[PDB]
From Swiss-Prot, chains A, B:
Pfam families: S_100. The gene is S100A6. It comes from the Eukaryota. GO terms for molecular function: calcium ion binding; calcium-dependent protein binding; S100 protein binding. InterPro entries: EF-hand-dom_pair, EF_Hand_1_Ca_BS, EF_hand_dom, S-100A6, S100/CaBP7/8-like_CS, S100_Ca-bd_sub. Ca(2+) 2 binds at D61, N63, D65, E67, E72. Homodimer; head to tail assembly of 2 subunits. Interacts with CACYBP in a calcium-dependent manner. Interacts with ANXA2 and ANXA11 (via N-terminus). Interacts with SUGT1. Interacts with TP53; has higher affinity for TP53 that is phosphorylated on its N-terminal domain, and lower affinity for TP53 that is phosphorylated on its C-terminal domain. Interacts with tropomyosin. Interacts with FKBP4. Interacts with PPP5C (via TPR repeats); the interaction is calcium-dependent and modulates PPP5C activity. Interacts with TPPP; this interaction inhibits TPPP dimerization. This is Protein S100-A6. Keywords: Acetylation, Calcium, Cell membrane, Cytoplasm, Membrane, Metal-binding, Nucleus, Phosphoprotein, Repeat. It is a peripheral membrane protein. Residues 12-47, 48-83 form the EF-hand domain.
């Protein structure tokens, strides 16, 4: 078993595929579909930051030109975790 | 909402840093220490799979042979998730 981790990877996977659903995007997310993911999940409120969101979205989709592949999404969430370095350290 | 994702990434991050903490507060984690992570966290009853675990350990550490690095751990968990295709299908 690996229940504690399974639920967590499960979360990322669920969030992703819930979004892929939006346009049946297999195991991929299209660049603006990703923005929709972020806007929905990461409820910024301060939409002024959308500039940062589009830079981030570019960084996500760049890995496969116009879409984020599942593993690139995971990888990038890793990068995001690293950016949230406080989370890493404690 | 953010919190569902935040806790999930939090899970992976915590799991990592709990173990890297053993060597120090590093975003890097040694190969046998990774195995020690897996054995506790990914509590495989079927320990006969040990061979598979050390191949997996090799695949994790292979990023620089000596140790797993945080980003590569996340990316690899991405691969693991992809292998768990069932989860991605539903």
């Amino acid at each position: 078993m690996a229940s504690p981790l399974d639920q967590a990877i499960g979360l990322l996977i669920g969030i992703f595929h819930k979004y892929s659903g939006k346009e049946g995007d297999k195991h991929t997310l299209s660049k603006k579909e990703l923005k929709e993911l972020i806007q929905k999940e990461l409820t910024i409120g301060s939409k002024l930051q959308d500039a940062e969101i589009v830079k981030l979205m570019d960084d996500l989709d760049r890995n496969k030109d116009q879409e984020v592949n599942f593993q690139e999404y995971i990888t990038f969430l890793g990068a995001l975790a690293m950016i949230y370095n406080e989370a890493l350290k404690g």
